[PDB]
Amino acid sequence: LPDSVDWREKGCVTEVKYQGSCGASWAFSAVGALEAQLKLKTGKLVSLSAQNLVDCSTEKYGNKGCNGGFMTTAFQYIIDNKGIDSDASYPYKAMDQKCQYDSKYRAATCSKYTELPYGREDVLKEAVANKGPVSVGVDARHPSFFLYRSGVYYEPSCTQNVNHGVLVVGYGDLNGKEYWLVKNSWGHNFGEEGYIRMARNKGNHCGIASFPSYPEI
Numbered sequence: 715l716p717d718s719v720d721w722r723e724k725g726c727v728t729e730v731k732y733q734g735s736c737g738a739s740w741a742f743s744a745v746g747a748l749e750a751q752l753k754l755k756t757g758k759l760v761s762l763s764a765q766n767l768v769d770c771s772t773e774k775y776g777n778k779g780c781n782g783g784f785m786t787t788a789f790q791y792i793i794d795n796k797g798i799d800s801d802a803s804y805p806y807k808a809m810d811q812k813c814q815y816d817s818k819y820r821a822a823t824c825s826k827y828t829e830l831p832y833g834r835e836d837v838l839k840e841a842v843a844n845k846g847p848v849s850v851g852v853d854a855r856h857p858s859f860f861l862y863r864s865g866v867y868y869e870p871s872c873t874q875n876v877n878h879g880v881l882v883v884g885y886g887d888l889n890g891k892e893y894w895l896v897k898n899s900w901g902h903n904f905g906e907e908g909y910i911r912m913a914r915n916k917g918n919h920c921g922i923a924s925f926p927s928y929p930e931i
């Protein structure tokens with residue numbers, strides 16, 4: 715119903731992270747979604763451990779750490795593992811390590827997650843507004859994406875085949891162009907202080923609504 719939302723205004727989004735040469739966008743996207751659900755229930759915003767997911771949500775979950783993974787099965791790990799550590803106590807090192815999870819430094823838990831219907835930008839809008847930040851995949855193969863500085867991103871050669879985990883933390887519009895407000899994990903010098911606004915309601919642009927998921931506590 716609201717024409718625009720931004721979950722940063724509601725205190726539900728952490729500092730933008732830097733994944734580096736490790737392709738752990740899936741882990742960053744997943745912890746970002748859970749982070750927001752943590753704040754909604756607990757009142758505490760704390761950066762959760764992407765590295766905990768890279769290291770422990772591995773072969774059983776169809777994830778290859780720094781060679782990519784799924785947010786959906788990352789949520790399953792946190793359910794199965796009965797918690798995830800804080801980034802503070804299990805920080806990010808941009809490589810594949812042995813699983814060093816420690817129940818002592820558990821900062822959050824996960825009960826279930828929800829996978830939204832394929833390519834449905836309307837349902838995604840509902841969830842973003844009413845549930846919270848949604849982990850999504852995008853097609854970020856194209857140099858335009860790498861280079862993005864500002865405004866609403868539209869790449870004509872963008873497919874709906876997704877390779878990169880991001881987190882939709884809102885939506886809105888700019889000069890008529892409707893956008894999704896997407897948190898990336900490529901440091902602060904990417905786009906708009908770490909964020910990118912990508913085309914909304916333009917035939918599932920770059921696959922943004924192809925595989926949306928969010929967790930719950």
Ligand SMILES: Cn1c(=O)n(C2CCN(CCCn3ccnc(-c4ccc(Cl)c(CNC(=O)c5ccc(F)cc5)c4)c3=O)CC2)c2cc(Cl)ccc21
Nearest residue numbers: 740775776777778781782783784787851876877878879925
């Ligand atoms: C070993 N086993 C496994 O594999 N499953 C998959 C995970 C859950 N569903 C995924 C289908 C939905 N679906 C389809 C296509 N694309 C994405 C997708 C979404 C977000 C992102 Cl960011 C990406 C990008 N990721 C990668 O490119 C990548 C690269 C390397 C890698 F190792 C993993 C992923 C893709 C996506 O979610 C089915 C296959 C298992 C499921 C079970 Cl019950 C038991 C064992 C499993």
